[PDB]
C-alpha cells in the first residue's frame, strides 16, 4: 500500500505534479489550510477528501457493516451543516428552523470532537465508528435519511 505525501505547489491542484499524480492514483485525501488556521491538529479537509475504492474496503468481515452508511450520512450531514452555517450568516440565524439548528450544532460538535484528534491519541476503527455514532445520536431517527432501515434502529438505540 502506497501513501505518498505530495506537496501541492502554490496551494492548488492545478500544478503539474499534483494533477499528474491525481491522474495516476486512485484517491485524494486533502488537508485544509483553514482548519490549520482554526487549529484543528488533523486538518484533513474531510468534505473535499474521497477514496475511489471505499466500497471494497468496507464490509462485514473486514470493518463493521454500518461503516459505509455512516460515512455517507456524515458526509451529507457535514455538507448540510456548512450550508446551514452559510444560511445562519446570511439571514441572521433567527429564521432558522429546528433542523437547521440541529445541523449547525452537529457541524460544531463534529469539528470539536471527530476532526480534532490528539497527536498521540489513538482510536481503533471500532472506537472511531462509535464516536461517529455518538455524534449521530443527536439527530432524530427519521432525520438520518441516508441510513438504511433496520441498521439505524440497530445502533441508534445506543
Amino acid at each position: 500500500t502506497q501513501i505518498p505525501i505530495l506537496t501541492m505547489p502554490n496551494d492548488d491542484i492545478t500544478h503539474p505534479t499534483p494533477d499528474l499524480t491525481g491522474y495516476i492514483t486512485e484517491g485524494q485525501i486533502y488537508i485544509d489550510r483553514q482548519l490549520q488556521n482554526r487549529q484543528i491538529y488533523p486538518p484533513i479537509n474531510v468534505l473535499p477528501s474521497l477514496s475511489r475504492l471505499m466500497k471494497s474496503a468496507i464490509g462485514e468481515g473486514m470493518t463493521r457493516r454500518d461503516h459505509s452508511d455512516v460515512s455517507n450520512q456524515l458526509y451529507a450531514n457535514y455538507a448540510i451543516g456548512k450550508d446551514v452555517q452559510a444560511m445562519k450568516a446570511v439571514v441572521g440565524e433567527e429564521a432558522l428552523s429546528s433542523e437547521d439548528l440541529l445541523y449547525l450544532e452537529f457541524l460544531d460538535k463534529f469539528e470539536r470532537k471527530f476532526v480534532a484528534q490528539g497527536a498521540y491519541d489513538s482510536r481503533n476503527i471500532f472506537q472511531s465508528l462509535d464516536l461517529a455514532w455518538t455524534l449521530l445520536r443527536i439527530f432524530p431517527r427519521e432525520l438520518l435519511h441516508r441510513i438504511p432501515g433496520k441498521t439505524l434502529d440497530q445502533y441508534y438505540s445506543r
Binding site: 452559510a86 446570511v90 441572521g92
Partner: protein, 213 residues
C-alpha cells in the same frame, strides 16, 4: 491584466468568491421570497376581511340611528363605546430586514372604552372589530412592502452578478491562461531549441574543422 500567474490566481480566487457569494445571495433571496409570499397570503386574508368589515360596521350606525337617533355630533360625536384611538408599533428585523409591526387601534396599546351606548355594543362589535382588522392590515402592508423592496434589490444583485461578474471574469481567466501558456511557454521552448541548435552546429563546425586540420 498582466498574464503573470499572480493575476491568474487572483482572478481564480475572485471567480470562486463570486460563485460563493452568488450561492449565498440566491439562498437569501429565496428565503426572503418565501417570507414575502407568506406575508402576501396574510395580507390577502385581511383584504378579504376588508369590505365585509365595513358592511358589519354599517349595522352599528343603523342601530345607533334606530335607538339614539342623531349622534352627539361636534367634538363628542357619540357612537363610540370602545376602541380608543391609541396604538403601539415597532420595527422588527425579520429575515434580516426591519419590518414595522404596525399594531393599530383595537390591537394597539392604551386602548380604552367608556361603558356602552344604546348602540355602543353594536359599535364595539362592528367599528372596533374593523379597527382590529385594520391593525393587522397595516402591519401586513408595511411588512409586505419592505419585503418586496428587499427581494427586488436582492434579485437584482443576484441577476447582475450572474449576468456580468462571472460572465466577465471567466473570459478574463481564459484570456490569462491563453496568453500565459501560448506566449511564455511557446517562446521559452523556442528560445531553448534555438540555443540547442546553436550549440549543435557549433559542435558540427568544430568537428568539421578538426577533420580539415
Amino acid at each position: 491584466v498582466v498574464p503573470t500567474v499572480t493575476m491568474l490566481g487572483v482572478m481564480k480566487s475572485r471567480l470562486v468568491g463570486a460563485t460563493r457569494g452568488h450561492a449565498l445571495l440566491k439562498k437569501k433571496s429565496d428565503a426572503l421570497t418565501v417570507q414575502f409570499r407568506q406575508i402576501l397570503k396574510n395580507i390577502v386574508t385581511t383584504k378579504e376581511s376588508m369590505g365585509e368589515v365595513m358592511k358589519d360596521s354599517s349595522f352599528a350606525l343603523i342601530e345607533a340611528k334606530y335607538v339614539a337617533g342623531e349622534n352627539i355630533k361636534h367634538i363628542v360625536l357619540e357612537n363610540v363605546q370602545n376602541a380608543s384611538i391609541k396604538v403601539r408599533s415597532r420595527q422588527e428585523n425579520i429575515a434580516g430586514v426591519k419590518i414595522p409591526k404596525f399594531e393599530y387601534f383595537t390591537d394597539g396599546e392604551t386602548k380604552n372604552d367608556l361603558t356602552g351606548l344604546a348602540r355602543g355594543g353594536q359599535q364595539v362589535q362592528q367599528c372596533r372589530a374593523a379597527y382590529v382588522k385594520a391593525i393587522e392590515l397595516l402591519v401586513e402592508l408595511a411588512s409586505l412592502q419592505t419585503s418586496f423592496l428587499t427581494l427586488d434589490e436582492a434579485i437584482k444583485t443576484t441577476n447582475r452578478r450572474v449576468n456580468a461578474l462571472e460572465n466577465v471574469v471567466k473570459p478574463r481567466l481564459e484570456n490569462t491562461i491563453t496568453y500565459i501558456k501560448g506566449e511564455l511557454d511557446e517562446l521559452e521552448r523556442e528560445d531553448f531549441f534555438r540555443l540547442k541548435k546553436i550549440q549543435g552546429y557549433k559542435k558540427r563546425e568544430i568537428e568539421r574543422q578538426l577533420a580539415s586540420s
